[PDB]
Write a protein that binds this ligand. Structure first.
Ligand SMILES: C[C@H](NC(=O)[C@H](Cc1ccccc1)NC(=O)[C@H](S)Cc1ccccc1)C(=O)O
Ligand SMILES: *[C@@H]1O[C@H](CO)[C@@H](O)[C@H](O)[C@H]1NC(C)=O
Ligand SMILES: *[C@@H]1O[C@H](CO)[C@@H](O)[C@H](O)[C@H]1NC(C)=O
Ligand SMILES: *[C@@H]1O[C@H](CO)[C@@H](O)[C@H](O)[C@H]1NC(C)=O
Ligand SMILES: [Zn+2]
Length: 696
């Protein structure tokens, strides 16, 4: 009564080799699940993190390489343009030839980089103003500095676009880094040395005089500027309530309530806004509605910005763009980035060029590349099996509402309404295969030169930004998928109320039509519940069946939700992570993803139970003295085998909304009565605490 199928001994092989039986699963189910993997493997020098998810991603890139690298005679133009962009990206001879000179020719278009410019005040500083310089950077190149203004979906009306104003991203991974002490010191030092190294090469290439002291001096200035910007930004934790974040305002209110004085403006929001939108030829008057996400950042900006020269501002502004660009130049410019990324990521080397390039084309031509990927790599009847799976887990969520004692009937039923209304996207959109005209036309307006990678990348920045801006007055496309298909991941959009499972994750260990159902439910099954449960986490409960930010909770049920979820805030917030020097997880910033995990695991388990009810129990797997309840959780766990470099652990504890994989396992199974049953765990065994968190 052992299954002896080749597909059976495949997954058994994988389960066996990853796990370590020497460990008591009730003591540390991560070590049990994954201890075999830990011992056998080492984080490559190019990886900040490694494990099964990351391995799937390296394997996906291999297919991408196979599909991109060989011209084919009946390649439609869409595929021809991706291949040419790939070839343009992997030709380092051509790139190295060009030195920095494609940067040098850019710089005049963004009002210069002062520290690397003679007589900048004369050249640029006379025409300069904040409104134009920020706007140029924003509209043409999609780099948002100082004040991030973008066109996105209106949270309170999901068919429309609105102008938003938000705080800008920083050059270091999180506001925390800018303390620049302790675990942060080297990142801070490498950052400014990076500035300095880049200003130096530019100066040398322009054959300008180099004074190390005035470089150190301007670039430290830029750091002090951004420190202030950083401290002015709002924490993630003050930003996690979308009803509070949503402040709709007329450009006219904005002008009255958020004055700025830059280089002695003073600052004019209408001009700023028009200097952006005039680029898709759109007209803004002071009656425009705007969603302001960081009112308090803007208020705080005021007395900071006043202190600094036009030269100072622009030295930061341009740096934040040049940052990104420098690894698309010659080796010496690539070199200049070494210590910085070592500090942030721990890696001693860059990823293979072909891999970077595959990934880049994927990210800029996701439909073109998803079509090639799925034709190479994805099965087709997979789509049908997952759909039915998704239908099952959706039902279980609905049916579960009835057992949840912390909601009221009105709220439950509105929650039902939302479930049923979730839109599922599976594998890929048929169109990218069956409609060449459509596929070609999405890239019509791009044309790549094979010896011109940098110009290609620039063209994509401008194209993408022009396209985004063009949306202001147009309706949101209800057909758009929120991920390419060539992605190892799944997704939920609140704005759209849509779950998506790209072909790339539809493979072992999450899914195969031929592997045991225990495994599929514990794999893609729990992924499905994760994504659906996002519709009802601390963010996505605030949006209704239609993707609109509107309150559909009673006060009591909402207050209960906070109460139930607070348990997970504390649980995870109480994990400390050796690889990040004992620092604790942020229990608030991971909350949503933690809720998704615990809700999703439970949902999937329930569906598997239902499956057994209906269908009977499964042939066992050879090599493994475990039943299928046990394998369900094993495979759940092994999804997350892996580990982190210290430097990157320090990064993601702050910047990742996910808990690290080991604690997604630990926290989730800790909360799972069904787990301690399967493995016969004594009370208050580490994996079986008396107190268990539950929301969904
Ligand atoms: C891999 C990891 N993703 C996930 O954990 C799951 C998808 C997933 C759920 C459960 C088990 C495996 C994968 N997806 C997610 O949690 C969210 S809804 C998707 C997301 C994408 C980018 C940033 C943040 C979130 C990651 O993006 O770092
Ligand atoms: C790379 O580009 C250079 C410069 O145009 C060219 O000489 C060479 O043929 C290209 N190599 C490949 C393999 O495309
Ligand atoms: C913005 O104001 C500046 C003032 O220097 C002016 O030169 C420019 O034409 C204005 N732009 C728009 C789009 O109104
Ligand atoms: C740990 O949990 C306790 C209560 O269970 C809570 O008071 C404390 O704040 C938590 N620690 C952290 C850092 O979250
Ligand atoms: Zn998630």
């Amino acid at each position: 009564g052992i299954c002896k199928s080749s597909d059976c001994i495949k997954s058994a092989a994988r389960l066996i080799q990853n796990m370590d039986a020497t460990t008591e699963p009730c003591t540390d189910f991560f070590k049990y699940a994954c201890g075999g993997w830990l011992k056998r493997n080492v984080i490559p020098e190019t990886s900040s993190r490694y494990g099964n998810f990351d391995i799937l991603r390296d394997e996906l890139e291999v297919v991408l390489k196979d599909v991109l690298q060989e011209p084919k005679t009946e390649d439609i133009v869409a595929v021809q343009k991706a291949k040419a962009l790939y070839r343009s990206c992997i030709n380092e001879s051509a790139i190295d030839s060009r030195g920095g000179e494609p940067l040098l020719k850019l710089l005049p278009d963004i009002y210069g980089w002062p520290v690397a410019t003679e007589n900048w005040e004369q050249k640029y500083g006379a025409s300069w103003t904040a409104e134009k310089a920020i706007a140029q950077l924003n509209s043409k190149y999609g780099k948002k500095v100082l004040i991030n203004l973008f066109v996105g979906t209106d949270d309170k009306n999901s068919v429309n676009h609105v102008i938003h104003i938000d705080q800008p991203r920083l050059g270091l991974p999180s506001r925390d880094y800018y303390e620049c002490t302790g675990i942060y010191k080297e990142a801070c030092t490498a950052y400014v040395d990076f500035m300095i190294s880049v200003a130096r090469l530019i100066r040398q290439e322009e054959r300008l005089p180099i004074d190390e002291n005035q470089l150190a001096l301007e670039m430290n200035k830029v750091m002090e500027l951004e420190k202030e910007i950083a401290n002015a930004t709002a924490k993630p934790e003050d930003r996690n309530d979308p009803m509070l974040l949503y402040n709709k305002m007329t450009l006219a209110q904005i002008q009255n309530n958020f004055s700025l004085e830059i280089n002695g403006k003073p600052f004019s929001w209408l001009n700023f806004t028009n200097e952006i939108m005039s680029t898709v030829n759109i007209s803004i008057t002071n009656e425009e509605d705007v969603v302001v996400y960081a009112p308090e950042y803007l208020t705080k900006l005021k007395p900071i910005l006043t202190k600094y020269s036009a030269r100072d501002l622009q030295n930061l502004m341009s740096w934040r763009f040049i940052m990104d660009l420098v690894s698309s130049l010659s080796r010496t410019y690539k070199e200049s980035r070494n210590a910085f990324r070592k500090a942030l990521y721990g890696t001693t080397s860059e990823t293979a060029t072909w891999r970077r390039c595959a990934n880049y084309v994927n990210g800029n031509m996701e439909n073109a590349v998803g079509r090639l990927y799925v034709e190479a790599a994805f099965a087709g009847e997979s789509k049908h099996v997952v759909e039915d799976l998704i239908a099952q887990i959706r039902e279980v969520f609905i049916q579960t509402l009835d057992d949840l004692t912390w909601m009221d009937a009105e709220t439950k039923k509105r929650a039902e309404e939302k479930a049923l209304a979730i839109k599922e996207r599976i594998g890929y959109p048929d169109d990218i295969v069956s409609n060449d005209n459509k596929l070609n036309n999405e890239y019509l307006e791009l044309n790549y030169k094979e010896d011109e990678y940098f110009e290609n990348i620039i063209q994509n920045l401008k194209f993408s930004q022009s396209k985004q801006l063009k949306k202001l007055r147009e309706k949101v496309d209800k057909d758009e998928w929120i991920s390419g298909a060539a992605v190892v991941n799944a997704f939920y959009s609140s704005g759209r109320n849509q779950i998506v499972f790209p072909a790339g994750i539809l493979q072992p260990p999450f899914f195969s039509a031929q592997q045991s159902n225990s495994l599929n439910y514990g794999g893609i099954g729990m992924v499905i519940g994760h994504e659906i449960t996002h519709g009802f986490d601390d963010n996505g409960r605030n949006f209704n069946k239609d993707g609109d930010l509107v309150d559909w909770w009673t006060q009591q049920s909402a207050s209960n939700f906070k109460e139930q979820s607070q348990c997970m805030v504390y649980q995870y917030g109480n994990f400390s992570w050796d690889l990040a020097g004992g620092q604790h997880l942020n229990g608030i910033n991971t909350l949503g993803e933690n809720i998704a995990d615990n809700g999703g695991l439970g949902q999937a388990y329930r569906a598997y139970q239902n499956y057994i009810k209906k269908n009977g129990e499964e042939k066992l797997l050879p090599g493994l003295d475990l039943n299928h309840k046990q394998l369900f959780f094993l495979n759940f766990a092994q999804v997350w085998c892996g580990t982190y470099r210290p430097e990157y652990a320090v990064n993601s504890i702050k910047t990742d909304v996910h808990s690290p994989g080991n604690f997604r396992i630990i926290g989730t199974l800790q909360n799972s009565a069904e787990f301690s049953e399967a493995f016969h765990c004594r009370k208050n065994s580490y994996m079986n605490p008396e107190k268990k968190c539950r929301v969904w």
